[PDB]
Every structure is written in structure tokens, then in C-alpha cells.
Amino acid sequence: AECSVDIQGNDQMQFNTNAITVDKSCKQFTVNLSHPGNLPKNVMGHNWVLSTAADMQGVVTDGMASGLDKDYLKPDDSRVIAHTKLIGSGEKDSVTFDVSKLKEGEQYMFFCAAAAHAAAAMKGTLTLK
Ligand SMILES: [Cu+]
């Protein structure tokens, strides 16, 4: 079982992966997010957020509306399965989630909810294997 992934969000508005695999034997799964570069949170903060494919657009839209001081996430958003905080350069965060929260046949997406980042393709698939 490989139950973790290290991901980077950079000063150029990209993640260094667009596909995460979760071994289904993993009871829990960990995402270790870091931010190469030197842009601070208020300019190019990133987070890592997991939802169903169908819920992504909404989480993103509501997140942008919620604003930077709420880490670009609507408080108590039930569409959000797991998430890191918003981080700037030299910062890091991790999130660990229950792998049983991922159901068969469902499509999952990860993304950064910061204003316009996901549109710029800071997103990818998350898949149970
Ligand atoms: Cu971002």
C-alpha cells in the first residue's frame, strides 16, 4: 500500500501532478502539500481540496466568494471531503482522510480553490485503485 502523495503548488500556478492514486487497501490517505517558490499566501496561496467531480465547480465558486481570509473555502461546505489550509511559499500542510469516504463508481477531483487557480488547471483526478 502507498497511502500518501507529496504535491507541490508553485509560483507559476501549477500542481506537479494531475492524477492521484489511492490504493483501496489504505485505511487512510495523506496528501503532503508544499509551495515551492517565493510568492506569499496573499498573492499565490494554494490549498488542496477534494470533492466529487460534480461538486467541484460549486466549491470553487463559493470558495472564491468566501475570499482569502477564509482560505478560499465556504465555511462548513459539506461538499468538501478533505482539505489543507491555504499555504504560501516555504509553507506546508498535510491532510489525512478516511479512504472509506470514497465510494465505488463515483468520480473524484482534487483542486486548489484559490481565486481562478483551478480554471488555470490546478486540478486533477483522484482515483481509488
Ligand atoms: Cu492555488
PDB file of C-alpha atoms and ligand atoms in Angstrom:
ATOM      1  CA  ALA A   1       0.000   0.000   0.000  1.00  0.00           C
ATOM      2  CA  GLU A   2       1.136   3.511  -0.954  1.00  0.00           C
ATOM      3  CA  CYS A   3      -1.054   5.698   1.246  1.00  0.00           C
ATOM      4  CA  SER A   4       0.477   9.125   0.692  1.00  0.00           C
ATOM      5  CA  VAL A   5       1.360  11.617  -2.024  1.00  0.00           C
ATOM      6  CA  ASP A   6       3.606  14.700  -1.999  1.00  0.00           C
ATOM      7  CA  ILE A   7       2.273  17.536  -4.119  1.00  0.00           C
ATOM      8  CA  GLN A   8       3.669  20.989  -4.931  1.00  0.00           C
ATOM      9  CA  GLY A   9       1.817  24.187  -5.959  1.00  0.00           C
ATOM     10  CA  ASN A  10       4.280  26.746  -7.405  1.00  0.00           C
ATOM     11  CA  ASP A  11       4.670  30.472  -8.227  1.00  0.00           C
ATOM     12  CA  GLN A  12       3.527  29.694 -11.791  1.00  0.00           C
ATOM     13  CA  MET A  13       0.095  28.423 -10.723  1.00  0.00           C
ATOM     14  CA  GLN A  14       0.691  24.701 -11.258  1.00  0.00           C
ATOM     15  CA  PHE A  15       0.485  21.444  -9.312  1.00  0.00           C
ATOM     16  CA  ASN A  16       3.204  18.888 -10.136  1.00  0.00           C
ATOM     17  CA  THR A  17       0.564  16.200 -10.681  1.00  0.00           C
ATOM     18  CA  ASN A  18      -2.895  15.994 -12.223  1.00  0.00           C
ATOM     19  CA  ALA A  19      -3.698  12.401 -11.146  1.00  0.00           C
ATOM     20  CA  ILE A  20      -3.556  10.941  -7.637  1.00  0.00           C
ATOM     21  CA  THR A  21      -3.963   7.201  -6.951  1.00  0.00           C
ATOM     22  CA  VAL A  22      -5.384   5.781  -3.681  1.00  0.00           C
ATOM     23  CA  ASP A  23      -4.712   2.072  -3.050  1.00  0.00           C
ATOM     24  CA  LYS A  24      -8.028   0.799  -1.663  1.00  0.00           C
ATOM     25  CA  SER A  25      -6.249  -1.294   0.977  1.00  0.00           C
ATOM     26  CA  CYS A  26      -5.247   2.061   2.575  1.00  0.00           C
ATOM     27  CA  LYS A  27      -7.442   2.761   5.597  1.00  0.00           C
ATOM     28  CA  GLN A  28      -6.383   6.438   5.467  1.00  0.00           C
ATOM     29  CA  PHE A  29      -4.694   8.552   2.794  1.00  0.00           C
ATOM     30  CA  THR A  30      -2.358  11.518   3.241  1.00  0.00           C
ATOM     31  CA  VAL A  31      -1.650  14.475   0.966  1.00  0.00           C
ATOM     32  CA  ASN A  32       1.539  16.450   1.763  1.00  0.00           C
ATOM     33  CA  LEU A  33       1.266  19.866   0.170  1.00  0.00           C
ATOM     34  CA  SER A  34       4.163  22.259  -0.304  1.00  0.00           C
ATOM     35  CA  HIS A  35       4.733  25.522  -2.103  1.00  0.00           C
ATOM     36  CA  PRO A  36       7.994  25.891  -3.977  1.00  0.00           C
ATOM     37  CA  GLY A  37       8.741  29.485  -4.973  1.00  0.00           C
ATOM     38  CA  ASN A  38       8.660  32.821  -3.105  1.00  0.00           C
ATOM     39  CA  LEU A  39       5.166  34.293  -3.574  1.00  0.00           C
ATOM     40  CA  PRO A  40       3.294  34.746  -0.298  1.00  0.00           C
ATOM     41  CA  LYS A  41      -0.184  33.442   0.542  1.00  0.00           C
ATOM     42  CA  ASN A  42      -1.964  36.659  -0.414  1.00  0.00           C
ATOM     43  CA  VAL A  43      -0.521  36.626  -3.977  1.00  0.00           C
ATOM     44  CA  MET A  44      -0.303  32.939  -4.851  1.00  0.00           C
ATOM     45  CA  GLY A  45      -1.630  30.915  -1.921  1.00  0.00           C
ATOM     46  CA  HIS A  46      -2.638  27.321  -2.737  1.00  0.00           C
ATOM     47  CA  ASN A  47      -4.658  24.680  -0.977  1.00  0.00           C
ATOM     48  CA  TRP A  48      -5.599  21.081  -1.769  1.00  0.00           C
ATOM     49  CA  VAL A  49      -9.331  20.263  -1.743  1.00  0.00           C
ATOM     50  CA  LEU A  50     -11.163  17.018  -2.596  1.00  0.00           C
ATOM     51  CA  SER A  51     -14.748  16.718  -3.745  1.00  0.00           C
ATOM     52  CA  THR A  52     -16.823  14.743  -6.222  1.00  0.00           C
ATOM     53  CA  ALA A  53     -16.342  15.816  -9.872  1.00  0.00           C
ATOM     54  CA  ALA A  54     -19.926  17.196  -9.848  1.00  0.00           C
ATOM     55  CA  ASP A  55     -19.386  19.342  -6.730  1.00  0.00           C
ATOM     56  CA  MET A  56     -16.060  20.927  -7.843  1.00  0.00           C
ATOM     57  CA  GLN A  57     -17.497  23.916  -9.761  1.00  0.00           C
ATOM     58  CA  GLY A  58     -19.636  24.861  -6.748  1.00  0.00           C
ATOM     59  CA  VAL A  59     -16.903  24.528  -4.064  1.00  0.00           C
ATOM     60  CA  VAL A  60     -14.642  26.692  -6.286  1.00  0.00           C
ATOM     61  CA  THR A  61     -17.265  29.377  -6.993  1.00  0.00           C
ATOM     62  CA  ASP A  62     -18.332  29.593  -3.324  1.00  0.00           C
ATOM     63  CA  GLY A  63     -14.712  29.451  -2.197  1.00  0.00           C
ATOM     64  CA  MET A  64     -13.726  32.458  -4.335  1.00  0.00           C
ATOM     65  CA  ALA A  65     -16.741  34.358  -2.940  1.00  0.00           C
ATOM     66  CA  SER A  66     -15.708  33.422   0.594  1.00  0.00           C
ATOM     67  CA  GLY A  67     -12.345  35.119  -0.021  1.00  0.00           C
ATOM     68  CA  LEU A  68      -8.697  34.841   1.017  1.00  0.00           C
ATOM     69  CA  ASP A  69      -9.234  35.351   4.736  1.00  0.00           C
ATOM     70  CA  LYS A  70     -11.428  32.229   4.718  1.00  0.00           C
ATOM     71  CA  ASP A  71      -8.679  30.299   2.848  1.00  0.00           C
ATOM     72  CA  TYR A  72     -10.918  30.443  -0.290  1.00  0.00           C
ATOM     73  CA  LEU A  73     -13.427  27.889   1.091  1.00  0.00           C
ATOM     74  CA  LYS A  74     -17.012  28.473   2.142  1.00  0.00           C
ATOM     75  CA  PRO A  75     -17.202  27.685   5.871  1.00  0.00           C
ATOM     76  CA  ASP A  76     -18.853  24.313   6.649  1.00  0.00           C
ATOM     77  CA  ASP A  77     -19.000  23.346   2.983  1.00  0.00           C
ATOM     78  CA  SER A  78     -20.347  19.739   3.078  1.00  0.00           C
ATOM     79  CA  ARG A  79     -19.190  19.110  -0.492  1.00  0.00           C
ATOM     80  CA  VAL A  80     -15.573  19.268   0.714  1.00  0.00           C
ATOM     81  CA  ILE A  81     -14.392  15.739   1.588  1.00  0.00           C
ATOM     82  CA  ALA A  82     -10.881  16.752   2.798  1.00  0.00           C
ATOM     83  CA  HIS A  83      -8.734  19.896   2.531  1.00  0.00           C
ATOM     84  CA  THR A  84      -5.481  21.543   3.581  1.00  0.00           C
ATOM     85  CA  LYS A  85      -5.269  25.153   4.688  1.00  0.00           C
ATOM     86  CA  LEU A  86      -4.115  27.796   2.222  1.00  0.00           C
ATOM     87  CA  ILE A  87      -0.285  27.971   2.109  1.00  0.00           C
ATOM     88  CA  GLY A  88       2.263  30.425   0.654  1.00  0.00           C
ATOM     89  CA  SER A  89       5.893  29.916  -0.400  1.00  0.00           C
ATOM     90  CA  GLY A  90       8.037  27.992   2.103  1.00  0.00           C
ATOM     91  CA  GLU A  91       4.933  26.836   3.972  1.00  0.00           C
ATOM     92  CA  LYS A  92       3.454  23.374   4.032  1.00  0.00           C
ATOM     93  CA  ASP A  93       0.430  21.421   5.231  1.00  0.00           C
ATOM     94  CA  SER A  94      -0.893  17.883   5.299  1.00  0.00           C
ATOM     95  CA  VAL A  95      -4.335  16.297   5.308  1.00  0.00           C
ATOM     96  CA  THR A  96      -5.255  12.702   6.125  1.00  0.00           C
ATOM     97  CA  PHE A  97      -8.673  11.321   5.214  1.00  0.00           C
ATOM     98  CA  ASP A  98     -10.720   8.180   5.614  1.00  0.00           C
ATOM     99  CA  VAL A  99     -10.428   6.138   2.410  1.00  0.00           C
ATOM    100  CA  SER A 100     -13.918   4.689   3.038  1.00  0.00           C
ATOM    101  CA  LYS A 101     -15.303   8.190   2.201  1.00  0.00           C
ATOM    102  CA  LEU A 102     -14.565   7.331  -1.436  1.00  0.00           C
ATOM    103  CA  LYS A 103     -17.398   5.295  -2.928  1.00  0.00           C
ATOM    104  CA  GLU A 104     -17.379   2.914  -5.926  1.00  0.00           C
ATOM    105  CA  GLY A 105     -18.313   4.349  -9.323  1.00  0.00           C
ATOM    106  CA  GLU A 106     -18.038   7.951  -8.093  1.00  0.00           C
ATOM    107  CA  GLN A 107     -15.685  10.392  -9.797  1.00  0.00           C
ATOM    108  CA  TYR A 108     -13.427  12.484  -7.540  1.00  0.00           C
ATOM    109  CA  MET A 109     -11.422  15.621  -8.266  1.00  0.00           C
ATOM    110  CA  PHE A 110      -8.722  17.461  -6.321  1.00  0.00           C
ATOM    111  CA  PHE A 111      -8.049  21.173  -6.903  1.00  0.00           C
ATOM    112  CA  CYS A 112      -6.842  24.435  -5.482  1.00  0.00           C
ATOM    113  CA  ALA A 113      -9.800  26.607  -4.518  1.00  0.00           C
ATOM    114  CA  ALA A 114      -7.807  29.906  -4.640  1.00  0.00           C
ATOM    115  CA  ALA A 115      -9.317  32.580  -6.932  1.00  0.00           C
ATOM    116  CA  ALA A 116      -9.019  31.406 -10.571  1.00  0.00           C
ATOM    117  CA  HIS A 117      -6.298  28.758  -9.906  1.00  0.00           C
ATOM    118  CA  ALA A 118      -8.442  25.706 -10.749  1.00  0.00           C
ATOM    119  CA  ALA A 119      -9.535  27.343 -14.029  1.00  0.00           C
ATOM    120  CA  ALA A 120      -5.820  27.739 -14.718  1.00  0.00           C
ATOM    121  CA  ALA A 121      -5.728  23.893 -14.336  1.00  0.00           C
ATOM    122  CA  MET A 122      -4.618  23.465 -10.711  1.00  0.00           C
ATOM    123  CA  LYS A 123      -6.782  20.348 -10.540  1.00  0.00           C
ATOM    124  CA  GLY A 124      -6.694  16.654 -11.230  1.00  0.00           C
ATOM    125  CA  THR A 125      -8.386  13.366 -10.680  1.00  0.00           C
ATOM    126  CA  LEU A 126      -8.355  11.314  -7.507  1.00  0.00           C
ATOM    127  CA  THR A 127      -8.989   7.610  -8.080  1.00  0.00           C
ATOM    128  CA  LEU A 128      -9.433   4.539  -5.860  1.00  0.00           C
ATOM    129  CA  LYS A 129      -7.321   1.655  -7.221  1.00  0.00           C
TER     130      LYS A 129
HETATM  131 CU    CU B   1      -3.637  27.696  -5.941  1.00  0.00          CU
END
